[PDB]
Subunit: 225 residues, 2 copies
Amino acid sequence: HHWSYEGENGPENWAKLNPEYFWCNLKNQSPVDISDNYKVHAKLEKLHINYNKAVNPEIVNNGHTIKVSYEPGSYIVVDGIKFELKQFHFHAPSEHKLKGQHYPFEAHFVHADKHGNLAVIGVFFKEGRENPILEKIWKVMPENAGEEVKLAHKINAEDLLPKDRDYYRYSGSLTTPPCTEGVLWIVLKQPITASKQQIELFKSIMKHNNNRPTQPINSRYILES
Amino acid sequence: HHWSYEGENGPENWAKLNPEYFWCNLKNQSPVDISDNYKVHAKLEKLHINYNKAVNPEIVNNGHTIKVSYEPGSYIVVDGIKFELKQFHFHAPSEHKLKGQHYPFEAHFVHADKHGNLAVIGVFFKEGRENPILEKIWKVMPENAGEEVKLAHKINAEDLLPKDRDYYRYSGSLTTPPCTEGVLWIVLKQPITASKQQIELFKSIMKHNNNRPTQPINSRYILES
Ligand SMILES: [Zn+2]
Ligand SMILES: [Zn+2]
């Protein structure tokens, strides 16, 4: 009964598939179109990002994305709370839209506080210079679902963030089942770059687009730092 | 199967009473503590309130609150959408807190667009001069649960609002079962007043407090105009 991005098990049917996926049909779902009608400017706190190197992380093709596990000890501080970075993974094209338009590629940095509350940092990619930290992961990326390899290199997830740290903030959900809500989303405004070849290798390995369609904003607003 | 504000069928157990009440345990519930920690100023549209008189409305004591039915044709316009006023009702002490403080009294004006989406305006009351609309309703409010009477007067809900129309805005839920989420909350900054007699009679008829405890803010911000 595997959920997918297409067909009878695609995103419109996710909540039907499994009693745990009831969230996918509710009112505060992600991703969203970031458009002017419901974004406002606000005085938001500076992003506090405290990342160390991950030594030899595991790289997993779970059939829906390429996921990189992160060793404990790296965190962000939001609203006073520490959220520890657990993993990051990729979507092509982007899940979030900017005024109705996709980016070719999006990375999600998934964090959890000590009670398991989630915060995700989203980073957009535009075509351009090959990203060389991406190139370390791509070189060894398992091509088939359910496969895991150990990267024999150190990597720092900070190198996959823009230097400019202005952001959008809203309250949403995981974008794959079970689609749990109460997720803090922080989407960085400035994209970084990846090569067209890096993006296309990811797409052929994924074999299909792996972005969930944007969801109704409902009674939410998006905040802009 | 019946719900209440205390005991075995009180707020922490609402979700167990009825499968339709699953919302009551999720992550975007109301009311909330309006706290400096997660409140930010923002450029928000002016409230557009277009209320006409309601001729001889029904007043119901449903065991949970005193509810006043409003005649069709009065509405607010938010984000371009017309929400028609259906009813208003009362809580003592208030449901929302400010900086951890209750007000003695709170009114909720419940609106719904043509598809049933909900917008609620909250108004705080402090103890002071008597309110003249409240006086008309209080004169004939049913004292026991399950009773209805028709008011023999016209009233305009606009006279239950403050003159100053600054507000807090956030995405939330109904505060009674089924606790549906996707509710746009608009809480007016400026309290108006009810007399000691008005507050005492309401509390006496309700027999017990009828406010839901405040709920975790989770990943939300409260916007201030
Ligand atoms: Zn993701
Ligand atoms: Zn209410």
